[PDB]
Amino acid sequence: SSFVEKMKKTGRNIIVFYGSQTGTAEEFANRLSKDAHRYGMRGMSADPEEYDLADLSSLPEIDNALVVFCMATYGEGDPTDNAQDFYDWLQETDVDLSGVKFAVFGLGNKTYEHFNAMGKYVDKRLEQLGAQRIFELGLGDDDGNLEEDFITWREQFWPAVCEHFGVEATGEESSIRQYELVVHTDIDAAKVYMGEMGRLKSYENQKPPFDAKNPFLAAVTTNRKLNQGTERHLMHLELDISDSKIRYESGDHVAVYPANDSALVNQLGKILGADLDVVMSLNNLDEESNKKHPFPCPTSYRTALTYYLDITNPPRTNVLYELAQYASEPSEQELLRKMASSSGEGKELYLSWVVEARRHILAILQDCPSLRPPIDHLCELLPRLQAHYYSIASSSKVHPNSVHICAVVVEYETKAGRINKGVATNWLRAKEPALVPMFVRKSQFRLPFKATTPVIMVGPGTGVAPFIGFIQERAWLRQQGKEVGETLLYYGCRRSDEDYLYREELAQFHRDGALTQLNVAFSREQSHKVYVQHLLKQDREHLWKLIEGGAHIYVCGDARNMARDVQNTFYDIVAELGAMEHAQAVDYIKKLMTKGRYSLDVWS
Numbered sequence: 001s002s003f004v005e006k007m008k009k010t011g012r013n014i015i016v017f018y019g020s021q022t023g024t025a026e027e028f029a030n031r032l033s034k035d036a037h038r039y040g041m042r043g044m045s046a047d048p049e050e051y052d053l054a055d056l057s058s059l060p061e062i063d064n065a066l067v068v069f070c071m072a073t074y075g076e077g078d079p080t081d082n083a084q085d086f087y088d089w090l091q092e093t094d095v096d097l098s099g100v101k102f103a104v105f106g107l108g109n110k111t112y113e114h115f116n117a118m119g120k121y122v123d124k125r126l127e128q129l130g131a132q133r134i135f136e137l138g139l140g141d142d143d144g145n146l147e148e149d150f151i152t153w154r155e156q157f158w159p160a161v162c163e164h165f166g167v168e169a170t171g172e173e174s175s176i177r178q179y180e181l182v183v184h185t186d187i188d189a190a191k192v193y194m195g196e197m198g199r200l201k202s203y204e205n206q207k208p209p210f211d212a213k214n215p216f217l218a219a220v221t222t223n224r225k226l227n228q229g230t231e232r233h234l235m236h237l238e239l240d241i242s243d244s245k246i247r248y249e250s251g252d253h254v255a256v257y258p259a260n261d262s263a264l265v266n267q268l269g270k271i272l273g274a275d276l277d278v279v280m281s282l283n284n285l286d287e288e289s290n291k292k293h294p295f296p297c298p299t300s301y302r303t304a305l306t307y308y309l310d311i312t313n314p315p316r317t318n319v320l321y322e323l324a325q326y327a328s329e330p331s332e333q334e335l336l337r338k339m340a341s342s343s344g345e346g347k348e349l350y351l352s353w354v355v356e357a358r359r360h361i362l363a364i365l366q367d368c369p370s371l372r373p374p375i376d377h378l379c380e381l382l383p384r385l386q387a388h389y390y391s392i393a394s395s396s397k398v399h400p401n402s403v404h405i406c407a408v409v410v411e412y413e414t415k416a417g418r419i420n421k422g423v424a425t426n427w428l429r430a431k432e433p434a435l436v437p438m439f440v441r442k443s444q445f446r447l448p449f450k451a452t453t454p455v456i457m458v459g460p461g462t463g464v465a466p467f468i469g470f471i472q473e474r475a476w477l478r479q480q481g482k483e484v485g486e487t488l489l490y491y492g493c494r495r496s497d498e499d500y501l502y503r504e505e506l507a508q509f510h511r512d513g514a515l516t517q518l519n520v521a522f523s524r525e526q527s528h529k530v531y532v533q534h535l536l537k538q539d540r541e542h543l544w545k546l547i548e549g550g551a552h553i554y555v556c557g558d559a560r561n562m563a564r565d566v567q568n569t570f571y572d573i574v575a576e577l578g579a580m581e582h583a584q585a586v587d588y589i590k591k592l593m594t595k596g597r598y599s600l601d602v603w604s
Ligand SMILES: Cc1cc2nc3c(=O)[nH]c(=O)nc-3n(C[C@H](O)[C@H](O)[C@H](O)COP(=O)(O)OP(=O)(O)OC[C@H]3O[C@@H](n4cnc5c(N)ncnc54)[C@H](O)[C@@H]3O)c2cc1C
Pocket: 253, 312, 358, 388, 389, 390, 391, 392, 406, 407, 408, 409, 410, 411, 412, 413, 421, 422, 423, 424, 425, 426, 462, 465, 466, 602, 603, 604
């Protein structure tokens, strides 16, 4: 299957590939594909992995061929896994792509080292190869508002396509269902999905290998509150992976498929007067597509809203639009409709009423009571429930049959006056010591190859997680008689008497000599604030010495402000004691990252 041939046979001329890991690039690519119709074109969205991009040179065979790439960037400016083959292709190929027309929208996050590196590389590479850019590279920023970055970009993409191929707005704009409903009245239980992903019964009859499509149901053997206060809830979990064949190393991530709050799901059924226990199936009206269902079908609505659908984040604009038609009351519909406009008051109303106020789907149906959409249409609009990532807090050398998690429970109050709860954390929190569907995702965050190499670990708050495993492995290495270099932890929290994670464990590790140094910064213990970077600055002399000697630096935690301040402080350090300019120090540090001596495991 050549993607070009498939376009020819299904009559399409616009193909939008998506580089996606948590499914955002997918919806974006899907939304572009459906837009084609308004401009007299026929487009399709596709997963690059399922094809050979070297076929891009056969695109001229289709009249008015146009390829659009929605690419997301991951770990150290790399391609999502489904686009690794494509990336590999782009670097070794020197094929001539004259005649190919393209546009690229990258999904990125300014708070990461290589911002939108994938999108930038694809766009730059296609031009070098000869293709013709039909519109400027799009730079979505998940730190600002990705959605807005998208609709803004889209609004200027279509017109630009219209002007190049000589087409126009068919005017037409009638919401088209992508799936068709079918109720299953006479259905056996052995044929109904109860929340497993991929293969039916995969949860009950567990067989390896276990990965994202076949999660291992680990038993929760330990779940204890790590902090003293009751204002927040930091917890430590231990997951049994015995009999799973799963392997991991300190630094890797453990992902889990949670379930929504059962009461919130019930509230939804009640505000839609829908019997959630009705088994059903949603079939793709495009018989030639691979996505026969938006999620494992057949399955009840309850199972769908609890295990396969994201009903907690703020809905994207295109979702608020389709739902407007179910708003009888004049003023409520008004509200919803505009919320999709590019800019104007509509952008502002969306950011304020939906995003800032953090209104989820229920919250909306509650603040627009006239709005009574059918449960099956909603089930098609909403995004999939994603796996959630946590930095493994254990060393496989010490706990080969157990994966540890250190996490803070997300719970806060919204402007709208509701109590918002985090899906995975509240779900994990209610797990009594009983199963969690998980899988390990390999990372590049790793202890030095040589045990004698020093390590500087900077992890405030839950950022301390991967380091708990690092410390265990380093203590275990001293025990096996190996010589180990210095091991310093720069931890931080608010008050030694409230959120000091693993206080006794770390204190004990230090007493034993495993932890060479334990430096904690309490940000709210005195007048002003003490952060990890301040302690890092004070130790400039020693850190420089270790750094000049070949030490490995690790930073884990808040990506927004922490990661950048800690890095700014390491800049100053190298600049002050390295006898060089700031800009040379920035170079210095950035070189360490490429040598693998300054590793980052940051999130937000
Ligand atoms: C590679 C990686 C590693 C990670 N490692 C860890 C780890 O070791 N430990 C850990 O605890 N977490 C970690 N995280 C964060 C973790 O994956 C989840 O995002 C977190 O546990 C929250 O999930 P949730 O499902 O409970 O929240 P969700 O339901 O997904 O909700 C989260 C969203 O709620 C919003 N939010 C949170 N607090 C507020 C507030 N006061 N006001 C307004 N909005 C708010 C934010 O917009 C946030 O994006 C990691 C993330 C990545 C990508």
